[PDB]
């Protein structure tokens, strides 16, 4: 049987990668970071509180100018926040209230959102009269949209519930490149600092690395236990972290091709919803389903702080490009900024 | 310097805040419902009598605003996007009572929804659809009861149960036996936070919206009593 031979060929190939990965694992990150100093207890207090959203907040994104941010809530509203003065800047109604993600253009001229409607919408913030209007609607996905990130004013990468990721041309509205290979639902994605590659996680306890320029899966990472909910790139672009339903966070390396460090605790039996790093990459901040956010020492895997200023589960998290503040959203319809 | 710009920013905030205050009144004035069901349940006819990945339908009963969402064109894996309906007023569940052991599959789906941690505070309205088809199959002896579920041999009509006018006892036992199957799961893991409302309905029953309106009234009434801690 050809199918049996192919299964045996795949099994032998999987064994070869396991042997190759085993040889490179002469040590672990914990052993290397054994003699370094701990980061110390991290104490942070809320500085700002943004109110006005009606339903639960599902996503948020910082701008490049580090004071403007956009947030999405499931009541069908996009609000642009001036974090310095707390004043609202824009209020964009949505065609569908079941929004699941939002994004901010690097130039600050556009915002994007998407959800259960399988459509990604682009809004123009620099209209002649100053009133926000929709600019383009991208369609073609057969599943709910989970995340989207801009590359420039004309390009964007999206992820969907159809186990597929795609790259779009905003001006023409066409799908330039399609990424396939995942078996489970794709929940999050993050672009590299040079925007030449991006990583994503799916509901199959696996992560994959893609090449944007020519559209193939370069590397595949396993080791997690359940569906992966969050993913983000390390500041240097040579590592990434993943949060899963197994109440355990993990760190990977693109050159080592295997797991480097695992973050877990006995009392934590709830999954991770959001993951993000700091500017130096020494601190790893993650949101949890138990209505709090914890701070992890990436090098030492020791919990260095806890944020418990939310009445519901933390659904989104973000760090400014300047590294000067951290903003978190939750199902209690409140945005909190910490420093 | 920047005081003029700062004043211009605050006047923009207050203008936005007035619109958001008006939108808050409208948002709370409508009740959101999630329409869910197994295959061949007939929910398409129900939603018809009151591509994109979701559908919307608006209807009014006694000047009350309702907004029903039908989740279509989505993948069969459901454990992720089901969490978006954790705050809806109620979840309408439609099953094929007449029916490869499709009834067992519906029971497992109902059990998972009932025991989901994010849906433990949401009540479920259950419609035992295809009542007419169930009666015909039972009369002709084609229904596969006593094969899917051997428990039908020892089952008896409930004491508080009342048969329909002119209804033969054979179909009355069959329809109630399926009804108690869902109640067995509903009874367990219940602490009064959510309830189940089973109804025997047909695909073309025009009074389905009235059943939802009455069931939503009870849910709201119990919700108010819970805040005052009377219950």
């Amino acid at each position, epitope marked *: 049987s050809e199918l049996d031979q192919l299964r045996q060929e795949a099994e032998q190939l*999987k064994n070869q990668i396991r042997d190759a990965r085993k040889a490179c694992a002469d040590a672990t990150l914990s052993q290397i970071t054994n003699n370094i100093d701990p980061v110390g207890r991290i104490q942070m207090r809320t500085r700002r509180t943004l109110r006005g959203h009606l339903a639960k907040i599902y996503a948020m994104h910082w701008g490049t100018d580090s004071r403007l941010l956009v947030s999405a809530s499931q009541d069908g509203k996009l609000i642009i926040w001036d974090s310095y003065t707390t004043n609202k800047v824009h209020a964009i109604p949505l065609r569908s209230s079941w929004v699941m993600t939002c994004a901010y253009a690097p130039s600050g001229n556009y915002v994007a959102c998407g959800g259960l409607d399988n459509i990604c919408s682009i809004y123009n913030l620099k209209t002649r009269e100053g009133n926000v209007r929709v600019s383009r609607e991208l369609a073609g996905h057969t599943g709910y949209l989970s995340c989207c990130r801009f590359l420039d004013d004309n390009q964007i990468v999206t992820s969907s519930g159809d186990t597929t990721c795609a790259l779009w041309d905003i001006e023409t509205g066409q799908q330039t490149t399609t990424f396939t290979g995942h*078996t*489970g639902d794709v929940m999050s994605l993050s672009l590299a600092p040079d925007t030449r590659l991006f990583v994503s996680g799916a*509901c*199959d*306890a*696996s992560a994959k690395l893609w090449d944007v320029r020519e559209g193939m899966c370069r590397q595949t990472f*396993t*080791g997690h*236990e*359940s*569906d992966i909910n969050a993913i983000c790139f390390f500041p240097n672009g040579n590592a990434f972290a993943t949060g899963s*339903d*197994d*109440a355990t966070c993990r760190l990977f390396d693109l050159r080592a091709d295997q797991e480097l460090m695992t973050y877990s605790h006995d009392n934590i*039996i709830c*999954g991770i919803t959001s993951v993000s790093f700091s500017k130096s990459g020494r601190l790893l901040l993650a949101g949890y389903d138990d209505f709090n956010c914890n701070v992890w020492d990436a090098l030492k895997a020791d919990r260095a702080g806890v944020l418990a200023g939310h009445d519901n589960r933390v659904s989104c998290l973000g760090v400014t490009d300047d590294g000067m503040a951290v903003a978190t959203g939750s199902w209690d319809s409140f945005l909190k900024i910490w420093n | 310097d920047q005081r003029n710009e700062e004043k211009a920013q605050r006047e923009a905030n207050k203008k936005i805040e007035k619109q958001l205050q008006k939108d808050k009144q409208v948002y709370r004035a409508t009740h959101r419902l999630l329409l869910l069901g197994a295959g061949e349940s007939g929910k398409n006819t129900i939603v018809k009598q009151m591509t994109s990945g979701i559908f919307e339908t608006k209807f009014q009963v006694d000047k009350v605003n309702f907004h029903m969402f039908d989740v279509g064109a989505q993948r*069969d*894996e*459901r*454990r992720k996007w*089901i969490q978006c309906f954790n705050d809806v007023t109620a979840i309408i569940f439609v099953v094929a009572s007449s029916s*490869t*052991n499709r009834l*067992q*599959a519906a029971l*497992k*789906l109902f*059990d*998972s*929804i*009932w*025991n*989901n*941690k994010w849906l433990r505070d949401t009540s479920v309205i259950l419609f035992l659809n295809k009542q007419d088809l169930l009666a015909e199959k039972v009369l002709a002896g084609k229904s596969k009861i006593e*094969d*899917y*579920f*051997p*428990e039908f041999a020892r089952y008896t009509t409930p004491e508080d149960a009342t048969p329909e006018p002119g209804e033969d006892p054979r179909v009355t036992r069959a329809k109630y036996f399926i009804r108690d199957e869902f109640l067995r799961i509903s009874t367990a*893991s219940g602490d009064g936070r959510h309830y189940c409302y089973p109804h025997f309905t047909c695909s073309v029953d025009t009074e389905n919206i009235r059943r939802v309106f009455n069931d939503c009234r009870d849910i709201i009434q119990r919700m108010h009593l819970r805040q005052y801690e009377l219950l």
Partner: nanobody
Amino acid sequence: QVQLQESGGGLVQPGGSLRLSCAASGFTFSNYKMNWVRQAPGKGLEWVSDISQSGASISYTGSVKGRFTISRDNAKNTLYLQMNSLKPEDTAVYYCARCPAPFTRDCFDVTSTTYAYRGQGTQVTVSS
């Protein structure tokens, strides 16, 4: 990588007996609920039986009650299905499935067309 490998089964006379063994590796076996799912030829996935984390709770589908029996071994990280008095209808491909979440009672997508935590399965044929 999460792996579920099944073993056993094969040709059997009607009214005979068979034993199915599920080999579990790569995950904590005691933290998850396990289910048995079979697929008859020309039909879709169907749920057969399940067992709780510690084995205190057991449930079967009505059509196989008494005939089949499910057991779990935490130490060996394996799951069993004892089959007795097999009928011709019992012929199908039996898969070993896991619930997607740990420390959780409910679990979805077990009988879905595509599932990331389902085994390859073994073929069971009942005929003379």
